[PDB]
Ligand binder design. Sequence first.
Ligand SMILES: *Cc1c(COP(=O)(O)O)cnc(C)c1O
Ligand SMILES: *Cc1c(COP(=O)(O)O)cnc(C)c1O
Ligand SMILES: *Cc1c(COP(=O)(O)O)cnc(C)c1O
Ligand SMILES: *Cc1c(COP(=O)(O)O)cnc(C)c1O
Lengths: 450, 450, 450, 449
Amino acid sequence: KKQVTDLRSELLDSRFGAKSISTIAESKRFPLHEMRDDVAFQIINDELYLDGNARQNLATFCQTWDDENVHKLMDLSINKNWIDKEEYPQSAAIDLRCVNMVADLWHAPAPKNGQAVGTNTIGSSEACMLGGMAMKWRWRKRMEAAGKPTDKPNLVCGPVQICWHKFARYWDVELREIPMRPGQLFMDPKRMIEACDENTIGVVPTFGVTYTGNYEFPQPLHDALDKFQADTGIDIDMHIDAASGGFLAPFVAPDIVWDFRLPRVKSISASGHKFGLAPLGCGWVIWRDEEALPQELVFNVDYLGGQIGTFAINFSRPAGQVIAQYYEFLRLGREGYTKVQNASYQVAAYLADEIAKLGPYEFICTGRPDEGIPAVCFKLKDGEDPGYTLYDLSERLRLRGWQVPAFTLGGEATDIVVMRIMCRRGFEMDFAELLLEDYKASLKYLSDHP
Amino acid sequence: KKQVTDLRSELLDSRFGAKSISTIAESKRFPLHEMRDDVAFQIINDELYLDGNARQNLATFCQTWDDENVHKLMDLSINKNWIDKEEYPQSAAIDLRCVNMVADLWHAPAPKNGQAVGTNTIGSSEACMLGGMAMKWRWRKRMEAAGKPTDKPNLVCGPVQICWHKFARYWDVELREIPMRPGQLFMDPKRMIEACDENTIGVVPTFGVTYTGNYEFPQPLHDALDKFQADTGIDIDMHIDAASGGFLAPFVAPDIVWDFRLPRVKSISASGHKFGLAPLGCGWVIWRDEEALPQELVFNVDYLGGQIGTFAINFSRPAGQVIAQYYEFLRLGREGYTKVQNASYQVAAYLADEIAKLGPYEFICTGRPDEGIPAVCFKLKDGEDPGYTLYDLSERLRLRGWQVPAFTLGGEATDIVVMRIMCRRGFEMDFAELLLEDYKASLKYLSDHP
Amino acid sequence: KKQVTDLRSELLDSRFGAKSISTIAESKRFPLHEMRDDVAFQIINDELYLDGNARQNLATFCQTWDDENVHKLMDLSINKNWIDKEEYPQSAAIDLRCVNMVADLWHAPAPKNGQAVGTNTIGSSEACMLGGMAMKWRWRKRMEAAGKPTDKPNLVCGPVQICWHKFARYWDVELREIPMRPGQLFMDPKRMIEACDENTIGVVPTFGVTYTGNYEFPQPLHDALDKFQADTGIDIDMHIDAASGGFLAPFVAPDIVWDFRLPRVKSISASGHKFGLAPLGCGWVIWRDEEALPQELVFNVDYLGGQIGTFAINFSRPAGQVIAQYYEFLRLGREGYTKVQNASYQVAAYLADEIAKLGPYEFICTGRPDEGIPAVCFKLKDGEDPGYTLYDLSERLRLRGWQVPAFTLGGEATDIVVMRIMCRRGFEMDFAELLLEDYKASLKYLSDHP
Amino acid sequence: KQVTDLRSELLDSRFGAKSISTIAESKRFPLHEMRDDVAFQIINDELYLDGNARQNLATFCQTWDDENVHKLMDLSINKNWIDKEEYPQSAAIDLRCVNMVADLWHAPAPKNGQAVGTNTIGSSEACMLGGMAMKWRWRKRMEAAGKPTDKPNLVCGPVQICWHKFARYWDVELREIPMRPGQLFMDPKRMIEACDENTIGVVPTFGVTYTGNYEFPQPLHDALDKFQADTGIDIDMHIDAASGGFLAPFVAPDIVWDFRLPRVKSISASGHKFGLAPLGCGWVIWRDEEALPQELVFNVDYLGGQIGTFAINFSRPAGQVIAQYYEFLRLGREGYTKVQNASYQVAAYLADEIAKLGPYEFICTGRPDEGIPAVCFKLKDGEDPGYTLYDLSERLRLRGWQVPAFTLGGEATDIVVMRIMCRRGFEMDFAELLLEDYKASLKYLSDHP
Ligand SMILES: *Cc1c(COP(=O)(O)O)cnc(C)c1O
Ligand SMILES: *Cc1c(COP(=O)(O)O)cnc(C)c1O
Ligand SMILES: *Cc1c(COP(=O)(O)O)cnc(C)c1O
Ligand SMILES: *Cc1c(COP(=O)(O)O)cnc(C)c1O
């Protein structure tokens, strides 16, 4: 009799009065029985409230808002496999159009066969790894042509994102990172060259440093590499990590020469899901030409009577993000992207100007299109003590749901603590003004409770 | 006033009467201006009709259907970044629970500290690469402990999926793939041993061969490695590529000893988005214990007052797939997965039995849970010419929307042409009956057209 | 021409690239012009993120979750006017049914004419004011019957909610609120009698004290009032403020005699939107019989050829909440309400037990259905200093989005600080465990920072 | 049998189910839980017995809301208006509205940047708040003069029922000037005749419900000025602008009815009437801090500070105020003017067309300078077209229209009038359908006794 009465309750009980929702969710072993689908969904939906409100997460560089058409395109493509070119041929075609468009945006030389050399990825990490492998292979071929050993490769870079550290570790390459230091939180030409030698597989400038938000300019570095070859005969290539800058500079600062306009730039990577406005799960890596991508790294697959070259670390994955990316390209175009990015810079500039009035801060990034990305980065003026640290301010802001990271820089600037505010699409002026209000209140509090 | 007149039309024109929809979509350069969002969506939505219907794609192993709750969870998580453990802490916690559940499902030794060693990935490709890197590292340590050189590593395997070829290429490991041959379309104990030597970083049995759908049983191979170490002193580990098998056997054939129950198995990988029932973009790799995973490959990140180890190639990416995976685990449990997988095997078995009476066929896979995955694989009997090849049949079926692949096997069986039908969730008996009807019709046509 | 180009942009610009979203929302003067409706919605939608997550708000007693059918009924009733009985006659009829059901739930004498004496209200506040006006009127009639003056009315009560202070102020009644004091945080029989006199219009027990979560039991007070009349000839009525308790005890503690089973109780009020499970905007007040409600306070209106009595402060208002309330009565019934409330009590008891293990606490409320509502209320043991105050704990929990109030009691217990956690529908066990985890984490932090 | 019935409970269709084979409970709390789809279906269905809101021409309240308001309301279904610290932005948004409405009514610019006023569930609560403040200011005046305060009275014209309730609930003698032939409102002469030192204030109705016409505060204000000059008695006003408050500012700005008038200490209006907000939104604004007795305000902590609160209700939905703010930003003066102009155009059209159909005498014809967008008429005195307006109202109801016909009060109880309200959502084309049914109804009433 109990079984039937229990089952009756299973059918009729409300979501929160149900027996199945009276226990803590499994966290150690694979569940034994099936359960009400509404209760399973409810529990998980509710647990996710413990994640931070994405729109208030001012620490991330990734998109936290997508328009309705992208939501639809994503749902519609939830089961389209990006890797199966023959099974989802139009998704594949759309992908190839994006490759052309991004290559064009970065001034890659026009492809004679009508198709640029490059590929979509899950993000900049995979894109960078692909660029790094190609870089390492081109170096090997150069050394082999010279009759020199290829067992001690190194890579020269500045304050790179962690993915390059993983590349170095995973592909056994010695990472030679020029450390940040007071006065120059980036890789300068002089220190770059001092780290270069015949075993350097390449140099990686970060066109939009994550820690500060400022651009490392490839041109001055390119000049130094030209002189290095003239003096030593050593020819070093560049791969630009433009995770953020790749989808900013072309629109608001087109005259900064950082891309394929520079001879030594053999490849560039960027995150479509950062300022490229695509939903999480989209990255891009373009090569200046076929010569820049070693064929031994490319796996060809049948496609519409012919073949297409593939270079990826991942295999199966959703094609929704690239479809969404194409949508943004067509819907916004240069005009639309410029308007959206200009909106972010205006917000960044506004906040930097207003926050400067509230305390003894020294700004590292103030939302200037010509210097970096739409971000605000600052620190307390040396020797100044307003009665609080940027860590305390970060915490107070969190009480209102905002995630504004405060952290120490690296290298020779480990004693410097900075606060960074990322101004992405969806962080409109009105919304940013609310942050400003909370910022003033927080300081107000820290003042009444020193 | 033509500018005012064009604008009026731009505002009032219907979807297909609009001037902006009168041209072919851009495919070579980045668009210059923005356009109506409905038109951009319509064009792309319509182009996607050229992709094959996913529900009729019987070539793929990946999920082509997800329940409504998964669609909701995915939409809700479109902007949750899997990599930001501190910003989306509960998404991170849910992921850690799945790691424990998958490890438990595969009989991994119980975690003393309550947390299994493993990670979520975009798919089995990344999971296999993580497993391979760890294998390579353990091998180098083993060689180094005996003062031996580590410049000639090789990996022994059978008819593996392409990701293993990419692993060998990207990490400079010699792939010793034992080829399929008549009467033996798998890596057998004897040939495996012939291929193994002091430079073998490990053996990778494929617990669910893509080309045939059959399991390569680790147990017999394991006994062979034990004897190998006894005779030569060479101790070789195994990594199971259970992309499909990992979420099948545990439910429908629990007595098959293929997992951590086997001492030499140091890691196992599988695709959540294949038989794990997760939406595209979910993979898993678990290690036996801490000793199985070299700490040098792990990058720790801050997490709730402590630190969490991370081992991944990708960085930013959506957390929706793992959240959906946890939902399936809780909603279905062993009971639910058993019922779902059983339905797939029932369909495969049905098709195999029905197709067998329509022609002179020899089956390689008939949907037997004790032999492999829910698939049907067959070829024309040796020396039989029914007046058509399986290529013709595959083509006829495509006229009704079905994608049923016909292909030649590799290795020393390149003369053999086989047809494979994958029976996934969402390919119910009634739907399969329709395929059967189209099969009978196709054969009649081929008959009336020798 | 500039106007044409501006118009083109107003039409084609994306949500965040639009000019109209580049400024701060008006807050001082009525706007002059119209603007894109999507921008207006976006700005407001985004500002609301600054409100606390209702599901994590553990301070409120009101519903923070409604099932899909309620969301539908509310949307369908958004334009139905509760006050227009003749224009929306069935909404009116449904409302009258709820009056009957609530009256019956509280053991009101069965209405001979089939319709209980009572009315729906926006909340307990209006309900309490209606009950208060009626009490005042009956008192005046009693005094007048003996030829005595009615210029000095007073109301006797314990730690009441603010609405009674407002009633006293708005209707010129001296509020004799018996203060909380160490050992008895409630109105006890002895002090109640001390405060009562010929000028007392009635006694108001709070069946579910907001500050502690405990019930003030009407029966012992009723016994005292009986003896009081016997000793002094002064006959005093009771009005039970059962804002919370009215939809709890009837289901989980039917043996508690607090309602119309007690002769002196002439009216009872409760919040439908608290434990009554109705969405915000629903309250109830029921009178014992016609004699308990002075007709001079009732305004009759035409209804279906007859007349219905109305007693309300508000006039026009949505009928969705009462329609939703009826749906909950029908869908859940006594069985459903019992299970939902049982779930809340289960959660309160769990947290009480677990939190007790974390520090030197003295509990005031532990979620016992025989003592009060599903709440947890505690203070630090007298003389114990764990290194932090409950205010500190409340603040740290807020860093995770939780709103757990810490406050000082009133009256003679102003030096006592307590923390109160409300366990409502939608605060399931699994969700509560997450809170407990943050509680443990918050304590560890407070210890690591003496 | 247990298992048998359970199987049916799981598989039965909505209408084949056992639980829907009986009449819904109406006497006692149901005992058992039941299928949620059946419970919903039953209620959804009996609600069809309510009149179609879009065809309800008797109500002044909104019967249509745009998609964004529907969304905002669903999103705010659980946001508690009263918990200022818990839903701080909802509260902030509310305060912006207070400023905007105060500005709309020419309230003196607040030096501290925040107007004195509050959102309410409707005009009823707003009027009661204004009434209490009015009563308290009067008490303070009498106490200063050293006179008794036990006999307060309130002077008004044909007020809505809420003022009768205020009078009863707060023990104030209501001195209502009755309507009479040719004067369906409170005129200056009769107002003054009812005023004395016990009058707590005067309440002009800027948009009389029964007729749709405005009672103009200016001439009444002039009479009160003269009254003080003559007697020394200083009487203030509270304008009940339930309807007019969100009409005149947009279509007839030159009418001086608001804070431009010195004696107007407070004004109330229904956001859910012509303010275009969904049901459950009212407003009351005071001209300054001095007009609102502090003894009536309960301060609550708010963002490190305190905010004064004056309300009868406590917990309630914040959706309506959020929706109200959306309309303010989305429409602005331009938008409201366009929306209100549309209603007046429809009211004027119907008045003109209905005039051609019978011997009617119009009381209201949708003129922006005279009142709200309504049509009100009666049969010419001594004229008998063979039917009453009651019969006409009934026949229109056969098509789903609710067009009320009723008798006026006071000295005009023998007068029967019909009133048509033209709100947002009663577009020209829709109104033309009503006109077609009106013509048909008359034609029918003609071929019959
Ligand atoms: C499909 C498959 C893979 C690749 O897994 P993804 O999820 O597509 O990256 C690897 N191994 C085997 C045996 C497979 O079937
Ligand atoms: C964010 C970032 C990355 C990693 O890109 P993903 O899209 O997260 O994989 C790499 N480099 C830089 C400079 C970045 O900012
Ligand atoms: C919450 C509460 C009230 C006020 O009820 P509302 O529904 O918010 O108006 C009154 N009394 C008690 C005891 C309460 O808890
Ligand atoms: C409708 C009305 C009221 C009552 O306002 P509610 O919003 O329904 O509470 C008061 N006065 C007048 C003049 C009205 O028209």
